[PDB]
């Protein structure tokens, strides 16, 4: 889901390694240093790309993921491991969450949602309605799966024209 | 209300991903540091965050501490400027913010006088005093605003101001 | 400039003490994770009870910028006003001057006293041939009071220091 | 004080022949009828009277109720209009009533600005802000009146008033 902060890239892995082995190594490693923040294994899963010698580590919690960053250079089967953040990682989470204002009220979820998907699929979206009436308040929020579309979308939507309202689109912040 | 929602606050624009306990720790810490806690112990008992709509509610142990916290409106929490407000189901004792309006030209009516007041925000109540025999204005009126913080905005924008040959007087009726 | 490690604080509660003030900000900083290392960011606090304002000194430029996020914060019930000092320069050395054309025989003092003719200097240095130790004919300086800079340029630039017209301009 | 004389009041112009018992019974009864009491029992514990100089002192069981009885000032008792004031040893904590003064012709000095101020009463504090490099008025000042009450009198008589080609602003600094 929102766990780009729950995964880690592992380069230079030894040849032959299995996902299980890697999994053990890091769980064992996390223990020796007391990097663990609870009983049980911090690493849920490991996916290996045998051809390009790399893999990803799936952690159960954020902090324990940040903690594993300290294993960069660590030795596994006589080879120095390379540890890095995934590329999707956002140190400042939600920084690309958009705000869509000036939405004519007659427009509904799917309508406004469609207006947005023009630039691509969303990972999140919600149109604010009045808890009482159930009607729309004229503003929404979304976040694009591909984070680099936020600027494309703003470019095409900010200032657009719908009915009599002037759409305001920017980062929610 | 008229007595509910006295120990809760709305917290908008919370940090994305923030936990409830974290939220709680931040506010309790501020209560001490800012010197708003009135007694030993945590002023904040619980935090209810709403993921999808990105907002939260704080639950305070006492009524007074709940009001003190209002002073945190705008406080920065992990880069985010917190929006602190009263629960919508909240509301103060009527006439708590009643306003007195003096220095109005007697020829003006309720709508003309109401139009100068409504430009600041909606009115929950309003009345222009008139001689019951003639129905002619006496030059002064009372009113209260739905949102009660518009009260000071109307005061700041109208009190002491010039309107005709007179100098408007706008203040809390008390 | 150290005015990049100082901040102004207004509306301080009556009777507050420099210690009380120092603990507050060092704690506010720690609470927000605005700290860039271990220890306290605030090194000291200066209080003027009469005009009820204060000055906080920090150990780093970043943290100083980081504390700007404390404007409107509550301390003893009262809201604090945090602002940058007036002698603040978002642009580090945009008033650093170049004094070229200096006669080939003058030295620090000789060249300095001429510059202090418009005010005290925060920084100065005469360029010399590291080996011969001989003057290269140009110097750089900066006035403690950055507002004199233009008056000094108006005053010196083009002056006749014996056998050549002095050149004074912002070194930028 | 800084904290003494917190539960006492001076009562002038008292009825002649009046007893301590009667005076006590009057205020206690008033605290109840006017809904000023805050707990079962009597807010007024004792009354000391000075027959010759015609005054008395009320002693309250609490700090808040004493402050409340302040509202009875001018109340008529057996024909007499009572003078309710605070003990002279009683002192408000500084800054409580500090006033801000804006809209001042930046060419005036301390004495000239105070002259207009002290016309409402004596100042126990005063300062006109001046550029430290030039020593020139910034056009605004702070001050505090010795007699706390003069505060709402300077405000009513100076706030929003005109002084030259400008409009004065006078209000508590809080």
UniProtKB/Swiss-Prot annotation, chains B, D:
It is found in: Nucleus. The modification Phosphoserine is found at residue 132. Changing residue 7 to W: In DEVDFB; likely pathogenic. It comes from the Eukaryota. The modification 5-hydroxylysine is found at residue 114. Residues 7-89, 97-174 form the RRM domain. Plays a role in pre-mRNA splicing and 3'-end processing. By recruiting PRPF19 and the PRP19C/Prp19 complex/NTC/Nineteen complex to the RNA polymerase II C-terminal domain (CTD), and thereby pre-mRNA, may couple transcription to splicing. Induces cardiac troponin-T (TNNT2) pre-mRNA exon inclusion in muscle. Regulates the TNNT2 exon 5 inclusion through competition with MBNL1. Binds preferentially to a single-stranded structure within the polypyrimidine tract of TNNT2 intron 4 during spliceosome assembly. Interacts with U2AF1L4. Heterodimer with U2AF1. Binds unphosphorylated SF1. Interacts with SCAF11 and SNW1. Interacts with ZRSR2/U2AF1-RS2. Interacts with RBM17. Interacts with PRPF19; the interaction is direct. Interacts with POLR2A (via the C-terminal domain); recruits PRPF19 and the Prp19 complex to the pre-mRNA. Interacts with KHDC4 (Isoform 2). Interacts with ZRSR2. Interacts with the SF3B complex composed of SF3B1, SF3B2, SF3B3, SF3B4, SF3B5, SF3B6 and PHF5A. Belongs to the splicing factor SR family. It is linked to Developmental delay, dysmorphic facies, and brain anomalies: An autosomal dominant disorder characterized by global developmental delay with intellectual disability and speech delay, epilepsy, hypotonia, short stature, microcephaly, intermittent exotropia, and non-specific facial dysmorphism. Brain imaging shows a thin corpus callosum and/or delayed myelination. This is Splicing factor U2AF 65 kDa subunit. It comes from Homo sapiens. The gene is U2AF2.
């Amino acid at each position: 889901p929102l766990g780009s902060a729950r995964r880690l890239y592992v380069g230079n892995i030894p040849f032959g390694i299995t996902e299980e082995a890697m999994m053990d190594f890091f769980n064992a490693q996390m223990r020796l240093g007391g990097l663990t923040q609870a009983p049980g294994n911090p690493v849920l899963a490991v996916q290996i790309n045998q051809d390009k010698n790399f893999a990803f580590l799936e952690f159960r919690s954020v902090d324990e993921t940040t903690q594993a960053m300290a294993f960069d250079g660590i030795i596994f089967q006589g080879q120095s491991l390379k540890i890095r953040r995934p590329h999707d990682y956002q140190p400042l989470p939600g920084a690309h969450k958009l705000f869509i204002g000036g939405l004519p009220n007659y427009l509904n979820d799917d309508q406004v949602k469609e207006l947005l998907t023009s630039f691509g699929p969303l990972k999140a979206f919600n149109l604010v309605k009045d808890s009482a009436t159930g009607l729309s308040k004229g503003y929404a929020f979304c976040e694009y799966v591909d984070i680099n579309v936020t600027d494309q979308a703003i470019a095409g939507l900010n200032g657009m024209q719908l009915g009599d309202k002037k759409l305001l689109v920017q980062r929610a912040s």
